Amino acid sequence: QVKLVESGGGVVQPGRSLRLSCEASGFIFSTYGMHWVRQAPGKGLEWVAVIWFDGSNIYYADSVKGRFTISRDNSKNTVFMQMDSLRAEDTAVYYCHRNFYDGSGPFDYWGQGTLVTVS
Amino acid sequence: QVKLVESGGGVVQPGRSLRLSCEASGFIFSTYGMHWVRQAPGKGLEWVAVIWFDGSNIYYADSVKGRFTISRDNSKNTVFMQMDSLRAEDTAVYYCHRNFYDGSGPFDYWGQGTLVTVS
Amino acid sequence: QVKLVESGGGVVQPGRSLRLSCEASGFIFSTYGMHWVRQAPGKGLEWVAVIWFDGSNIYYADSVKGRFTISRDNSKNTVFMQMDSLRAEDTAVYYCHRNFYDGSGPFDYWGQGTLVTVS
Amino acid sequence: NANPNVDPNANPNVDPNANPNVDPNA
Amino acid sequence: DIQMTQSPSTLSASVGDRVTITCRASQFISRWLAWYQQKPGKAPKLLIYKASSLESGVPSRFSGSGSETHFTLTISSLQPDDVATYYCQEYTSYGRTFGQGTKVEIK
Amino acid sequence: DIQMTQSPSTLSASVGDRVTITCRASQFISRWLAWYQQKPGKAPKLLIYKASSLESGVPSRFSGSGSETHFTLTISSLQPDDVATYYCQEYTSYGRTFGQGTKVEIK
Amino acid sequence: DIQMTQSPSTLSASVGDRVTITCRASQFISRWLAWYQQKPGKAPKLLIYKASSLESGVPSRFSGSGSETHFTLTISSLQPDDVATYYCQEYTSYGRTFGQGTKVEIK
């Protein structure tokens, strides 16, 4: 059964780093790609970044460029997000999402999200 | 109370034209398509032409194609069929038919038919 | 109204061969391919071979490779399977089956099954 | 036509089409 | 060019008898076949819309089944009220094709 | 840099009514518009696969249309169970773009 | 090479009980998994069209679910008529892969 399990949140004082992760389960991340979607409480969803399988396609939202970096642990089937120099505006729930479409129907897969507070 | 009402028939001299029409009532032609079905007296049904919503996907039976033109009046919710160069083989009752399937059930919608006689 | 009827089974000495056939009825084998499915007594189903319409995409289970050949008689609407070098482990009921899905639902079409004994 | 999130490979056993007279979503 | 042919173009049976009409497509139509009943003086009535799925209001007498190219309309317990010409209709695309029309009378 | 906009930021209708949610883009989506339903406190669920394509398991009451840069989500027979924020997602490349979200309440 | 495995090789339950059968693919098969019911001595009946979609004519007791590699068949309110060997079938390409099959017995 496919699940995306986020972990690694907490309270980060301003200017400090945080390293989040999403453990894949039920599938091997060997196909499409993984997305981080952020939601500040009271706000809508913001896509933040994608790491395509094998790192051939790395993209970020303008709001985090040069501050966030994403990567994959290719042995543990786990996706990581390195968040440096965090600011108050980055408070949000960070969700792990794995959406693709393939013939038979859509696939989405959302996790529960990791809460990151930056105050 | 959904009806299709045909008109514009009558007796036409061979080589002359008639312009048939079918009024939509109780529904809006906003979705699928509209058909004309011909039945020469004593014979079975013959499909004549289809117009698809927005005036596309236009198809005709080989027996009528090039003599018949089908078009939609987008203001009057009415379908028109221009029948040119009529010949004796075109004598028939021309029925207006709106058929599609979805959701809760089939929709057949037949009118009564306008008689076209070539004399 | 669709039948697939297997024949050509019986008892064959190990090392020899049988030619099984499946007569199609109720449908021209116009498009989707036809499969032989094997069931050794007391065991579950094993797919054995597929012949695709027009004799193109032909595949076999590894367990029968180099021994079975599948072909279609394109005049009689029937599929033949030549089973060479039969062994005791090939005792099975050989069923004819055509599976293809298309919009309106599935079309399973299973036959009755012919028993092949190879002792 | 191309989209990186979509695999353009039909299943040989399923007709990748629809009947225009019938709503594809039942 | 999906030609539709109804083989038993003329049928007749006594009331309560069972009759069938066979419609054969020259091409595969994937169950997209409707059947219609045309009473004299009236536009055709839909009876079966999808290879045995019935139109609401249709008597239990009517049924049918079929697949791919070979389809049948059946009438159990045939009544005088069923003297109509029956038509099979292919509806796989834009436009429709009707069979020749099969008439069922009463003995 | 593609902006996604949902103009009717808040809608409300009684149970059984019809809710119309429009969605526009500054650049072509070309039918690659997914619609998501987010119940507050939960991750969003996908409703609409692409313009006019409903995902299996999503009630038939949901439907929609559009192309190019103009799309609509329709909620028929609105239920209390539909109070969610609905979002537009553009998936035309390696990454997603989301709209603001429209809140649909009950009268 | 796809090795489909059905875990509960033998199931046993009283009438009205709920039982499930799981099936695991060794490769991604994108929901293209069918389920069949084979009674002794007969060709198998197709029950589930695609994971999550039930074949017409099959009792509502049968409900499929799952995706990519992990699939389930649920039989609600198990009846005596459900004693059969159930098989999962991979259909992503030419040919089919059948699972070992599971047998459902009644207490």
Author numbering:
A (entry chain M), B (entry chain O), C (entry chain H): 1 to 52, 52A, 53 to 82, 82A, 82B, 82C, 83 to 100, 100A, ...
D (entry chain G): 105 to 130
E (entry chain P), F (entry chain N), G (entry chain L): 1 to 107
Can you quote the paper on this entry?
PfCSP, the primary surface antigen of P. falciparum sporozoites, is a major target for vaccines and mAbs as it is both highly conserved and critical for the initiation of malaria infection. Like many of the most potent NPNA-specific mAbs, L9 is encoded by the IGHV3-33/IGKV1-5 heavy/light chain gene combination. However, L9 is highly specific for the NPNV (minor) repeats and relies on critical contributions from the light chain for both NPNV selectivity and high potency.
For structure solution, a recombinant PfCSP construct was used, rsCSP, that contains the full N-terminal, junctional, minor repeat, and C-terminal regions, and about half the number of NPNA repeats as the 3D7 reference strain. To overcome both aggregation and preferred orientation of the L9 Fab-rsCSP complex in vitreous ice, a large cryo-EM dataset was collected which resulted in a 3.36 Å resolution reconstruction. In the cryo-EM map, we observe three tightly packed Fabs bound to a central rsCSP, with each Fab simultaneously interacting with the peptide and the adjacent Fab via homotypic interactions. The L9 epitope is centered on the NPNV type-1 β-turn, which resides in a deep, central pocket on the Fab formed primarily from CDRL1, CDRL3, and CDRH3, with smaller contributions from CDRH1 and H2. Notably, Y97H accounts for the greatest amount of BSA in the L9 paratope of any HC residue, and this largely stems from the interaction with V4, suggesting that this CDRH3 residue is critical for selectivity of L9 for NPNV over NPNA. Our cryo-EM structure reveals that L9 achieves this through multivalent Fab binding to sequential NPNV repeats stabilized by an extensive antibody-antibody, or homotypic, interface between adjacent Fabs. In the cryo-EM structure, L9K of FabC packs tightly against L9H of Fab B, and extensive polar and hydrophobic contacts are made between CDRL1 and the LC framework region 3 of FabC (LFR3) with HFR1, CDRH1, and CDRH3 of Fab B. Four somatically mutated residues in L9K, F28L and R31L in CDRL1, and E68L and H70L in LFR3, account for the majority of BSA contributed by the LC to the homotypic interface.
